[PDB]
Amino acid sequence: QGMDFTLNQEMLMTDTKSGALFYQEEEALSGVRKIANKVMHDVELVFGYQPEATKDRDMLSRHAVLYGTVGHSPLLDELNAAALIDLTEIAGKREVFLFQVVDQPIQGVEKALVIAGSDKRGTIYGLFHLSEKLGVSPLVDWSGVLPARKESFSLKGDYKYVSKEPSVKYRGFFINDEWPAFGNWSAKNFGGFNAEMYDHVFELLLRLKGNYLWPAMWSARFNDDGPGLANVELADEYGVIMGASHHEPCLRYGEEYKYLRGPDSIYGDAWNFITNREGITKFWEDGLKRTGHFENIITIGMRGEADTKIMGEDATLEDNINLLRDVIQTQNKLIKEHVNPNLKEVPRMLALYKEVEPFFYGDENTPGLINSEELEDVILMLCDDNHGNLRTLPTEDMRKHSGGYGMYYHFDYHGGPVSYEWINSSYLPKIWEQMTMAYDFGVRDLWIVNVGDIATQELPLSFFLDLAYDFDKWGTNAINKTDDYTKQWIEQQFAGVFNLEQKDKVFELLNGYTKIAHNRRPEAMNVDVYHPVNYHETDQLLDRIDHLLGLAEELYQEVDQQHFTAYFALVYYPTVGNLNLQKMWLLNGKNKYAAQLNLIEANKLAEQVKACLKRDQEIVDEYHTIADGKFYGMGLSEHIGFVHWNEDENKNPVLSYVLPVNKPRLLVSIDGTELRSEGSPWHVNTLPLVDFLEPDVNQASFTISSVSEKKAEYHISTDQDWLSCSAANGVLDGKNKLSETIHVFVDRDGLADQAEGRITVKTPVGKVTIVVPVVNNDFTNYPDMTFVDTKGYISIEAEHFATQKATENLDGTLNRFEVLDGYGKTLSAIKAFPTDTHYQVGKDAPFVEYHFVTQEAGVYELEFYLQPSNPVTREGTMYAGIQVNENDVDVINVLPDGYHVDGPHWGIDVINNIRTTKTKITCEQGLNKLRIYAVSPGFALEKIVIYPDGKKLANSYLGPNETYYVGR
Amino acid sequence: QGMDFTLNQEMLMTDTKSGALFYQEEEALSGVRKIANKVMHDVELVFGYQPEATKDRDMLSRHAVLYGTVGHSPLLDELNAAALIDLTEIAGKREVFLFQVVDQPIQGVEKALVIAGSDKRGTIYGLFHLSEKLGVSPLVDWSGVLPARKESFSLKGDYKYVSKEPSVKYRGFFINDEWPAFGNWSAKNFGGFNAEMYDHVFELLLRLKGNYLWPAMWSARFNDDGPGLANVELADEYGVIMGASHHEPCLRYGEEYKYLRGPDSIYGDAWNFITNREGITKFWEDGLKRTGHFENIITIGMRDATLEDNINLLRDVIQTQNKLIKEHVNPNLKEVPRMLALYKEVEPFFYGDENTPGLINSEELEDVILMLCDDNHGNLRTLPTEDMRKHSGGYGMYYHFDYHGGPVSYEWINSSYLPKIWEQMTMAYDFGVRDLWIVNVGDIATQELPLSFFLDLAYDFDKWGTNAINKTDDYTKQWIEQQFAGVFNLEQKDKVFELLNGYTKIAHNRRPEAMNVDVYHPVNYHETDQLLDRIDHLLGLAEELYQEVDQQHFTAYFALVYYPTVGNLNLQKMWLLNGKNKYAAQLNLIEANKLAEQVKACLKRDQEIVDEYHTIADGKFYGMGLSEHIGFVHWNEDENKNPVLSYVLPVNKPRLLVSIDGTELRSEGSPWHVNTLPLVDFLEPDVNQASFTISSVSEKKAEYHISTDQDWLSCSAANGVLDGKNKLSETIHVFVDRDGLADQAEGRITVKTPVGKVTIVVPVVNNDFTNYPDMTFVDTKGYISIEAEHFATQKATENLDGTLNRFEVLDGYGKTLSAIKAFPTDTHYQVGKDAPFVEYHFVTQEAGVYELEFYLQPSNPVTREGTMYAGIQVNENDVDVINVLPDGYHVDGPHWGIDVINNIRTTKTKITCEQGLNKLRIYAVSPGFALEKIVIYPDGKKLANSYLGPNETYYVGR
Ligand SMILES: [Cl-]
Ligand SMILES: [Cl-]
Ligand SMILES: [Cl-]
């Protein structure tokens, strides 16, 4: 073993160093040497002094860093020959490295860290592994995350690590939807979409261990904007594999044809393989000749320009399929002639994006494109629904396909039903659930995510690429570890900046804002999405938001100057931007609702809405000016009040103001409901307050509110000794005191199982009676987790099942429902694992069992709240099993009639981030059992609501909050 | 004849008079002598000097006023015996007077004006006839209308007028819904509902020639609050006949039982004739003993089970009451005026049904007045059939100018409209409702014009009724002259006419408590903007006269014209502006914000105008405007709400909204959404103007560029800029050069904004349509809208006696231009026999099925059958007699309630049209059919929504 490998400041300072730190070989790949220079800059940031590389071995330091690519490093071969390293451990493997400390490697060097890559990208990942061990974040350049300073660093004398091949072969992202943000950012900071800008993109990709990129393509030409070929040449030097979107075949990005087409052009003047066959063919041929020798994946197929359909509305399905078959046969011929005669050596990809997925499978009449011999060895790239929900996935027979499968996922989308492009609104639990399911179904060759303008997507992009790189650490076998991922990601950005308590506050912020944003994405958030009063959903979310904004402002003031930019760009701006916008709309909902009741308190709520809107513009301006405009333009997208799929005609909150009425009237309202009254004997003056119908509830409240600017006295009394309120008398004036909240108290000590009291509220113009029924039976006579109907309905978070039954497989594994912590709109969700089996009731299907007590026998509605997943097969169905008591199991379709991605129901559900389905069941009086069996994949259940046939519950965004269960 | 009768200032002044002006006889009725003292005070107002009365004939002036009641005046009998007057022409007649100048009547008197009444009230009306001749308004005391000063007054030496018996026997009004207004007014000005207060009520009633009153009864007790019997004694002295509403039988007002009932009371403790028969009977007996000897009409009747047993109960109640009246009032029932109210609940007991006889024609109701009522909103309900009109005792009508109840109360300021009153009340007279007319006037204040009219109509139906169609405008001008003679010149008096006629028309289309946001559409057909422009013209006139009126007539102008005009119209304006504010704010237009400030200012003005009303003339009207009246959400004021103001926050980009005026079409110019808008105004050949608007949504400078693609198409602007701060919107006028333009052409306007481009398509029709006859409506816009008076032809039918049945135009009637109705109004016409028709000509674009929609005054059927028919005939095919009422229609039902608050009923039927020229005949069949508008559109087409319906479309000769 010997002594440790050591690096310290003395080693780097000119007065005390013994030699150069890094060794440089003429035989090294140019791109590897460039990454090595980036890592030397990381050393300078950690230690404060610039390290130096040398080509002369006698000029090395006593402790030296020796890096190389196998087959491109005579030194690596010498070390291997002397048996100080064992290159057979990594030779021939894809993107692997050896990271090993070695004793006395050459004369003058006492210890060395050896970094040997199996290939170019393996060496690059190993170099950045050194960066990682020195504490340098992958976002060091992209987000300005400065590493903690060190005086010294050590590794044990026999340190040795051999990485593993990446779990997914091609891994990366797509810069898309790039105007106005990215365009203005690139122009101001770099002069355009040129090699200077792309060097930072390439570095970010490789530091995140990605290897594949779709470049910006809306008003840019990656192959031409280097200037010239400099972008392509730089990518190829670094080993960033270039690709192209679904509509950019044969190495031609989407804007190229616009400049090369014309009436007298060899490429014709029609993006149309039927009428301009020869022009389009020579276009693809010249594209393949121009960049075919660089490292890329060739996209094949043909879609319309700027993400349109290739054919019109009158196009049949066989015509669309007859065309693609013809195009692909032509493209393969071109590739064989001008790229490589051995088609199997050429990576190619066919996107089954949007309308193309129906083209792949076909129908009863049209034997579809699947299993074509022209698709042999081609990657078949499946796509989500543009909103983060997978579509169909490989069947077992499809998983035989040589060439494998890809997945194109979205964190950002410009399109219907509503775009989302401003600030991250994706949530790690959802990403984990969807992308691990894609891996489970055998989608393992290519993963790419649309990240828009990249900014604010750093946490979910890091996760997506860490999942792609090491699926065994973060994937299916690591359920409920995205919280741990987040905390590790916070440590990576903020080590030495924040103490333990501050880092847990950062965790609250990141986990906090992304859960809320994912429940209603920013551009789609608006007034009356959440109900202004029902179930306290608005006020509970406002209180959460106010708690999180408070934490974000504490850390804003505590972070030191050196690390402010990273705190702001990574945590403060995404949190406050999203949550200030949510708050604005939620307050607007309260403002509007109070104004329809002529409540003076509306006017103060309007001023609060106005202040939120002002803060939205202030935080964007701050974002565009920190660190000398490092993020200029990244927050430019219109994002408030969309009324269309895009920003056209979007609208700000409309403020409602009230004019006081003349008489000293007072509105009495029951908190958490729409029940209200001014006490007239001629209209409704008796209100139910039902909170104490659950035996473990000991607090409730109602409010008294001004409608005039006159002084109005109220008097409160109750008609039972066990029932009391926080006040007996008071006065409101419409100027300084506008409302009063009265707390109600029930003394349960010695109270019968059912009781009913009445509160009388006298106002200057009338009298409101509040009826207070109480349940004091605590139902110990039922088992724990028994839900008891006392309010007229039952609402169950799906995780609160009473029992569950798993089934067993041959290998010893189990099929079971699992709780996904924090998943969905509310508490969590349950989902069956393994995720790719089609279960059969009575055979292998697992179940969960809920216990619940009805007041009357009869027909009940059973409503599921489900994640809006899409069917995994081309048959477009999704089933679950339900069994009530001992009746037969009923296998029910949980989708609407005629369901399909891009249809009407799909579009409602994707914006609500929830699907609801209803079925009728017959229950006994008293104790009932409900079993839910998994059948189809994609079934993720968040909440169950049960209520008698024909009853209608108060409307809300989240559904009714959970009702009472024994042991709660 | 000889010399004129003359009265002048010198004959009244202490230094130059020859004697007392009025002669006073000890034999005169004391109530007549009280009214003569009121007329002497009127003489003092006109001439400036107080006249004197004398009991000594030697002390009379050379020219003297001699008044008397036949049978209570020795002097009248002396004049009669000397043949200077002829009392046989008034003797034994009801409420008639002789008003005659006679020469040398008695020694020392050279000329006299003799005023001889046939009875007490005839004498009183004759005395007030003198006040009328001297220019004194009936409102002189009630509203403080001072007469113009005279130096001299003359009548010809042979002047002679004999009045006529009133057309309706009992005529008056009901003070009702009297809290909070009238109760606070009377408390403050008189200390309560006592005889000091009621003296002013009685005088107003008699100066308007009424004779019948239902007193305040919500909390007041007319028979006890005099104090004691002083109100009832005073009414009886004047000859004001007291009555009571339908639930106040046997001279017991509604609040009396509350104070006399109880577990140990001789009257029992339950308003229930079956369980407390003896107690209720004693209660009625003591009621009749207490005031049965005063002049009144006794209400009979008494406000689960079987039809037969309810007839049995009501018959028992009425028999008991008639027996009480015989025993304690007068053994000759026929001498005792009695009234039974035919409400809705009792009506089945009156008619009975197929198997048990009803009270109709029974001995019990013989000689009883049968009082019908409207529907509480000014529309009559059922009316006597031909056989019912033989009923001895006749019929009454209870009509409403004020109502506390559903669907929405109307109690604040007059919202009744003279053409409508005339139409309903002349129809009641035509169906034989002629013995009693009474109107609910609420607190009285601001109801002076329609109450004056209602009682003038009742008194002299030959002058103002069915034979005087389209005279309510003349009535209004004469009323204005009666209040403002000598105050306003002729130009000013026609402005007062625009105010009164203007406000009442607008208030009657949506009554104030029921006015709210989005009743009128914020943009469609310019209905909101046309009403706001009319209101701003009327408010400007009201302010002009407010500043011009003489100080001594200021408070009469304020109470009679200014306050009801501005109160009503400022409230309409506030809600109309609120609808524009709300609509602009949903588009994020910056201009919403100044509209909100405008709404707020209207609300402030409403409070100020009421406060001024309550302070002028030392509080003479204190309390009369107290009733809550804004934004009712229930039938009553509970939980009413003010307008909610919408404010906009500017967006970031310099966007511009382009909108087509008069429609909801709008665009911000995006290529991805709607960016082409039709502007259809020039599809009518005689239209030469149209416009669109460009509006700011941001506070950024935003430039626009306008061009057109046709020589003949042009705009008032080519380039401009808006900034969201000082300049928020611009209206662009569009011009079409029709000289030399083809019969159909189409042009396009392009409006370029910072963020997009909007194309406005401008189709033009330039065909005259001379080839068709005048009054032909031509469909060029996809629908036809016809004001009902624009028929092309009409056909009357002739009765055997030479009279004609025909449609007539009622000028100003209804919600829009006017209405048509067949006269006479009480015939059930039959198509092919006597039914008259009007005929409309219209040209369709294509043959097929069209919807024919009628806009009708919301009248109720006049029979118990609940139906109302009209005939339609298209192109001389088969006449179809259609029911213009909804299925199951009934007063208080759901459709009735919608229609009554909209003040319109719409009905739709399908007709088949040829291509090109079509003829539509509409035949009168049932009574009650008043047609205002007809809209014709292709089957299945939906027109833009509005309150008043689409405005009238092009017709040849327009
Ligand atoms: Cl769907
Ligand atoms: Cl008659
Ligand atoms: Cl009805």
PDB file of N, CA, C and O in Angstrom, chain A residues 596 598 644 646-652 654-657 659-660 662-663 665 678 680 683, chain B residues 585-586 588 628 636-642 645-647 649-650 653 655 668 670 673:
ATOM      1  N   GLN A 596     -68.010  38.623  -4.326  1.00  0.00           N
ATOM      2  CA  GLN A 596     -69.380  38.220  -4.661  1.00  0.00           C
ATOM      3  C   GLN A 596     -70.296  38.222  -3.447  1.00  0.00           C
ATOM      4  O   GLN A 596     -71.532  38.196  -3.599  1.00  0.00           O
ATOM      5  N   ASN A 598     -69.953  40.775  -1.210  1.00  0.00           N
ATOM      6  CA  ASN A 598     -69.830  42.186  -0.811  1.00  0.00           C
ATOM      7  C   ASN A 598     -69.052  42.307   0.504  1.00  0.00           C
ATOM      8  O   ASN A 598     -69.378  43.153   1.358  1.00  0.00           O
ATOM      9  N   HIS A 644     -54.864  30.021 -23.958  1.00  0.00           N
ATOM     10  CA  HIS A 644     -54.668  29.101 -25.057  1.00  0.00           C
ATOM     11  C   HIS A 644     -53.508  28.181 -24.734  1.00  0.00           C
ATOM     12  O   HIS A 644     -52.918  28.231 -23.651  1.00  0.00           O
ATOM     13  N   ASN A 646     -50.659  28.365 -26.125  1.00  0.00           N
ATOM     14  CA  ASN A 646     -49.500  29.246 -26.090  1.00  0.00           C
ATOM     15  C   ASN A 646     -49.888  30.564 -25.414  1.00  0.00           C
ATOM     16  O   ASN A 646     -51.015  30.746 -24.929  1.00  0.00           O
ATOM     17  N   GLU A 647     -48.936  31.488 -25.367  1.00  0.00           N
ATOM     18  CA  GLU A 647     -49.060  32.728 -24.615  1.00  0.00           C
ATOM     19  C   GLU A 647     -49.984  33.753 -25.258  1.00  0.00           C
ATOM     20  O   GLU A 647     -50.250  34.782 -24.624  1.00  0.00           O
ATOM     21  N   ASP A 648     -50.428  33.547 -26.499  1.00  0.00           N
ATOM     22  CA  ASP A 648     -51.297  34.519 -27.142  1.00  0.00           C
ATOM     23  C   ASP A 648     -52.500  34.839 -26.259  1.00  0.00           C
ATOM     24  O   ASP A 648     -53.182  33.936 -25.777  1.00  0.00           O
ATOM     25  N   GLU A 649     -52.771  36.133 -26.090  1.00  0.00           N
ATOM     26  CA  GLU A 649     -53.954  36.616 -25.371  1.00  0.00           C
ATOM     27  C   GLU A 649     -53.944  36.210 -23.899  1.00  0.00           C
ATOM     28  O   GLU A 649     -55.001  36.179 -23.254  1.00  0.00           O
ATOM     29  N   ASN A 650     -52.772  35.950 -23.320  1.00  0.00           N
ATOM     30  CA  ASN A 650     -52.816  35.556 -21.915  1.00  0.00           C
ATOM     31  C   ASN A 650     -53.198  36.761 -21.073  1.00  0.00           C
ATOM     32  O   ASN A 650     -53.130  37.920 -21.526  1.00  0.00           O
ATOM     33  N   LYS A 651     -53.676  36.482 -19.859  1.00  0.00           N
ATOM     34  CA  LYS A 651     -54.288  37.560 -19.090  1.00  0.00           C
ATOM     35  C   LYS A 651     -53.921  37.475 -17.616  1.00  0.00           C
ATOM     36  O   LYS A 651     -53.854  36.391 -17.022  1.00  0.00           O
ATOM     37  N   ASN A 652     -53.719  38.652 -17.033  1.00  0.00           N
ATOM     38  CA  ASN A 652     -53.423  38.777 -15.612  1.00  0.00           C
ATOM     39  C   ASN A 652     -54.671  38.524 -14.753  1.00  0.00           C
ATOM     40  O   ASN A 652     -55.804  38.534 -15.258  1.00  0.00           O
ATOM     41  N   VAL A 654     -57.797  39.344 -12.588  1.00  0.00           N
ATOM     42  CA  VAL A 654     -58.701  40.479 -12.531  1.00  0.00           C
ATOM     43  C   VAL A 654     -59.045  40.706 -11.056  1.00  0.00           C
ATOM     44  O   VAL A 654     -59.436  39.763 -10.355  1.00  0.00           O
ATOM     45  N   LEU A 655     -58.878  41.931 -10.574  1.00  0.00           N
ATOM     46  CA  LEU A 655     -59.100  42.210  -9.150  1.00  0.00           C
ATOM     47  C   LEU A 655     -60.538  42.649  -8.952  1.00  0.00           C
ATOM     48  O   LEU A 655     -61.053  43.454  -9.735  1.00  0.00           O
ATOM     49  N   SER A 656     -61.171  42.173  -7.880  1.00  0.00           N
ATOM     50  CA  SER A 656     -62.535  42.585  -7.571  1.00  0.00           C
ATOM     51  C   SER A 656     -62.474  43.490  -6.354  1.00  0.00           C
ATOM     52  O   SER A 656     -61.808  43.147  -5.376  1.00  0.00           O
ATOM     53  N   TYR A 657     -63.146  44.631  -6.412  1.00  0.00           N
ATOM     54  CA  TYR A 657     -63.257  45.512  -5.261  1.00  0.00           C
ATOM     55  C   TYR A 657     -64.716  45.699  -4.875  1.00  0.00           C
ATOM     56  O   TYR A 657     -65.598  45.744  -5.726  1.00  0.00           O
ATOM     57  N   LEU A 659     -67.895  47.727  -2.808  1.00  0.00           N
ATOM     58  CA  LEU A 659     -68.388  48.995  -2.308  1.00  0.00           C
ATOM     59  C   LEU A 659     -69.295  48.685  -1.113  1.00  0.00           C
ATOM     60  O   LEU A 659     -70.255  47.902  -1.259  1.00  0.00           O
ATOM     61  N   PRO A 660     -69.037  49.253   0.073  1.00  0.00           N
ATOM     62  CA  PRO A 660     -69.827  48.880   1.273  1.00  0.00           C
ATOM     63  C   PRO A 660     -71.313  49.118   1.093  1.00  0.00           C
ATOM     64  O   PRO A 660     -71.728  50.100   0.508  1.00  0.00           O
ATOM     65  N   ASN A 662     -75.158  49.916   2.857  1.00  0.00           N
ATOM     66  CA  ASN A 662     -75.610  50.933   3.821  1.00  0.00           C
ATOM     67  C   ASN A 662     -75.896  50.371   5.215  1.00  0.00           C
ATOM     68  O   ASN A 662     -75.560  51.013   6.216  1.00  0.00           O
ATOM     69  N   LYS A 663     -76.567  49.156   5.324  1.00  0.00           N
ATOM     70  CA  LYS A 663     -76.965  48.735   6.674  1.00  0.00           C
ATOM     71  C   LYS A 663     -75.842  47.967   7.358  1.00  0.00           C
ATOM     72  O   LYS A 663     -75.027  47.328   6.689  1.00  0.00           O
ATOM     73  N   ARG A 665     -74.744  45.156   8.379  1.00  0.00           N
ATOM     74  CA  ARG A 665     -74.987  43.743   8.208  1.00  0.00           C
ATOM     75  C   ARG A 665     -73.694  42.974   8.428  1.00  0.00           C
ATOM     76  O   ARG A 665     -72.577  43.486   8.223  1.00  0.00           O
ATOM     77  N   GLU A 678     -76.748  35.805   6.317  1.00  0.00           N
ATOM     78  CA  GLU A 678     -76.857  37.088   7.008  1.00  0.00           C
ATOM     79  C   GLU A 678     -77.938  37.120   8.079  1.00  0.00           C
ATOM     80  O   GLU A 678     -78.187  38.190   8.653  1.00  0.00           O
ATOM     81  N   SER A 680     -81.301  36.421   7.786  1.00  0.00           N
ATOM     82  CA  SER A 680     -82.662  36.884   7.573  1.00  0.00           C
ATOM     83  C   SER A 680     -83.662  35.781   7.929  1.00  0.00           C
ATOM     84  O   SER A 680     -83.470  34.628   7.532  1.00  0.00           O
ATOM     85  N   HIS A 683     -84.957  33.992   4.532  1.00  0.00           N
ATOM     86  CA  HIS A 683     -84.087  33.167   3.698  1.00  0.00           C
ATOM     87  C   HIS A 683     -83.329  32.207   4.616  1.00  0.00           C
ATOM     88  O   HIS A 683     -83.758  31.911   5.730  1.00  0.00           O
TER      89      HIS A 683
ATOM     90  N   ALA B 585     -62.860  44.205 -18.411  1.00  0.00           N
ATOM     91  CA  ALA B 585     -61.843  43.635 -17.517  1.00  0.00           C
ATOM     92  C   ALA B 585     -61.548  42.166 -17.842  1.00  0.00           C
ATOM     93  O   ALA B 585     -60.409  41.719 -17.684  1.00  0.00           O
ATOM     94  N   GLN B 586     -62.542  41.415 -18.318  1.00  0.00           N
ATOM     95  CA  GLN B 586     -62.312  40.048 -18.803  1.00  0.00           C
ATOM     96  C   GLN B 586     -61.436  39.993 -20.058  1.00  0.00           C
ATOM     97  O   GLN B 586     -60.897  38.917 -20.391  1.00  0.00           O
ATOM     98  N   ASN B 588     -58.790  42.121 -20.190  1.00  0.00           N
ATOM     99  CA  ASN B 588     -57.583  42.793 -19.680  1.00  0.00           C
ATOM    100  C   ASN B 588     -57.425  44.185 -20.329  1.00  0.00           C
ATOM    101  O   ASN B 588     -56.318  44.653 -20.576  1.00  0.00           O
ATOM    102  N   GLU B 628     -84.140  50.624   0.818  1.00  0.00           N
ATOM    103  CA  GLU B 628     -83.044  49.973   0.090  1.00  0.00           C
ATOM    104  C   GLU B 628     -83.525  49.600  -1.282  1.00  0.00           C
ATOM    105  O   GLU B 628     -84.642  49.104  -1.432  1.00  0.00           O
ATOM    106  N   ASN B 636     -86.990  40.541  -1.587  1.00  0.00           N
ATOM    107  CA  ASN B 636     -86.879  41.688  -0.695  1.00  0.00           C
ATOM    108  C   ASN B 636     -85.410  42.111  -0.589  1.00  0.00           C
ATOM    109  O   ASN B 636     -84.542  41.594  -1.287  1.00  0.00           O
ATOM    110  N   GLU B 637     -85.143  43.096   0.255  1.00  0.00           N
ATOM    111  CA  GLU B 637     -83.832  43.719   0.310  1.00  0.00           C
ATOM    112  C   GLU B 637     -82.784  42.884   1.023  1.00  0.00           C
ATOM    113  O   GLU B 637     -81.619  43.286   1.014  1.00  0.00           O
ATOM    114  N   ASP B 638     -83.155  41.774   1.668  1.00  0.00           N
ATOM    115  CA  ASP B 638     -82.180  41.009   2.449  1.00  0.00           C
ATOM    116  C   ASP B 638     -81.005  40.580   1.563  1.00  0.00           C
ATOM    117  O   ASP B 638     -81.194  40.034   0.470  1.00  0.00           O
ATOM    118  N   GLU B 639     -79.784  40.833   2.040  1.00  0.00           N
ATOM    119  CA  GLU B 639     -78.557  40.441   1.349  1.00  0.00           C
ATOM    120  C   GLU B 639     -78.369  41.156   0.008  1.00  0.00           C
ATOM    121  O   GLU B 639     -77.639  40.662  -0.868  1.00  0.00           O
ATOM    122  N   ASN B 640     -78.972  42.331  -0.196  1.00  0.00           N
ATOM    123  CA  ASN B 640     -78.706  42.977  -1.478  1.00  0.00           C
ATOM    124  C   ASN B 640     -77.245  43.402  -1.533  1.00  0.00           C
ATOM    125  O   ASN B 640     -76.550  43.499  -0.499  1.00  0.00           O
ATOM    126  N   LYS B 641     -76.758  43.595  -2.750  1.00  0.00           N
ATOM    127  CA  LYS B 641     -75.327  43.813  -2.964  1.00  0.00           C
ATOM    128  C   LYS B 641     -75.110  44.937  -3.958  1.00  0.00           C
ATOM    129  O   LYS B 641     -75.873  45.084  -4.910  1.00  0.00           O
ATOM    130  N   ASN B 642     -74.058  45.721  -3.733  1.00  0.00           N
ATOM    131  CA  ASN B 642     -73.646  46.774  -4.656  1.00  0.00           C
ATOM    132  C   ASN B 642     -72.915  46.169  -5.862  1.00  0.00           C
ATOM    133  O   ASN B 642     -72.547  44.986  -5.839  1.00  0.00           O
ATOM    134  N   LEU B 645     -66.625  45.994  -8.586  1.00  0.00           N
ATOM    135  CA  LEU B 645     -65.768  46.679  -9.538  1.00  0.00           C
ATOM    136  C   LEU B 645     -64.637  45.747  -9.957  1.00  0.00           C
ATOM    137  O   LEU B 645     -64.022  45.094  -9.111  1.00  0.00           O
ATOM    138  N   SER B 646     -64.364  45.690 -11.250  1.00  0.00           N
ATOM    139  CA  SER B 646     -63.250  44.892 -11.754  1.00  0.00           C
ATOM    140  C   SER B 646     -62.134  45.848 -12.121  1.00  0.00           C
ATOM    141  O   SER B 646     -62.380  46.823 -12.835  1.00  0.00           O
ATOM    142  N   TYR B 647     -60.917  45.570 -11.668  1.00  0.00           N
ATOM    143  CA  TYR B 647     -59.743  46.324 -12.084  1.00  0.00           C
ATOM    144  C   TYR B 647     -58.755  45.407 -12.790  1.00  0.00           C
ATOM    145  O   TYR B 647     -58.581  44.261 -12.388  1.00  0.00           O
ATOM    146  N   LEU B 649     -54.831  44.547 -14.330  1.00  0.00           N
ATOM    147  CA  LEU B 649     -53.419  44.782 -14.183  1.00  0.00           C
ATOM    148  C   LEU B 649     -52.768  44.637 -15.546  1.00  0.00           C
ATOM    149  O   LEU B 649     -52.968  43.608 -16.205  1.00  0.00           O
ATOM    150  N   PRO B 650     -51.992  45.617 -16.000  1.00  0.00           N
ATOM    151  CA  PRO B 650     -51.491  45.588 -17.393  1.00  0.00           C
ATOM    152  C   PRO B 650     -50.612  44.380 -17.694  1.00  0.00           C
ATOM    153  O   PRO B 650     -49.799  43.949 -16.877  1.00  0.00           O
ATOM    154  N   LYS B 653     -46.616  42.527 -22.720  1.00  0.00           N
ATOM    155  CA  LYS B 653     -46.243  42.879 -24.098  1.00  0.00           C
ATOM    156  C   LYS B 653     -47.142  43.966 -24.673  1.00  0.00           C
ATOM    157  O   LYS B 653     -48.313  44.071 -24.292  1.00  0.00           O
ATOM    158  N   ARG B 655     -49.502  44.667 -26.675  1.00  0.00           N
ATOM    159  CA  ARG B 655     -50.567  44.033 -27.423  1.00  0.00           C
ATOM    160  C   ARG B 655     -51.742  44.989 -27.580  1.00  0.00           C
ATOM    161  O   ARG B 655     -51.954  45.892 -26.760  1.00  0.00           O
ATOM    162  N   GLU B 668     -56.692  39.749 -30.945  1.00  0.00           N
ATOM    163  CA  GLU B 668     -55.368  40.349 -30.788  1.00  0.00           C
ATOM    164  C   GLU B 668     -54.419  40.032 -31.942  1.00  0.00           C
ATOM    165  O   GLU B 668     -53.236  40.403 -31.892  1.00  0.00           O
ATOM    166  N   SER B 670     -53.359  37.074 -33.465  1.00  0.00           N
ATOM    167  CA  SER B 670     -52.379  36.008 -33.489  1.00  0.00           C
ATOM    168  C   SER B 670     -52.637  35.098 -34.695  1.00  0.00           C
ATOM    169  O   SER B 670     -53.793  34.760 -34.974  1.00  0.00           O
ATOM    170  N   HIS B 673     -54.806  31.814 -33.604  1.00  0.00           N
ATOM    171  CA  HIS B 673     -56.182  31.854 -33.117  1.00  0.00           C
ATOM    172  C   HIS B 673     -57.007  32.722 -34.066  1.00  0.00           C
ATOM    173  O   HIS B 673     -56.645  32.915 -35.232  1.00  0.00           O
TER     174      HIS B 673
END
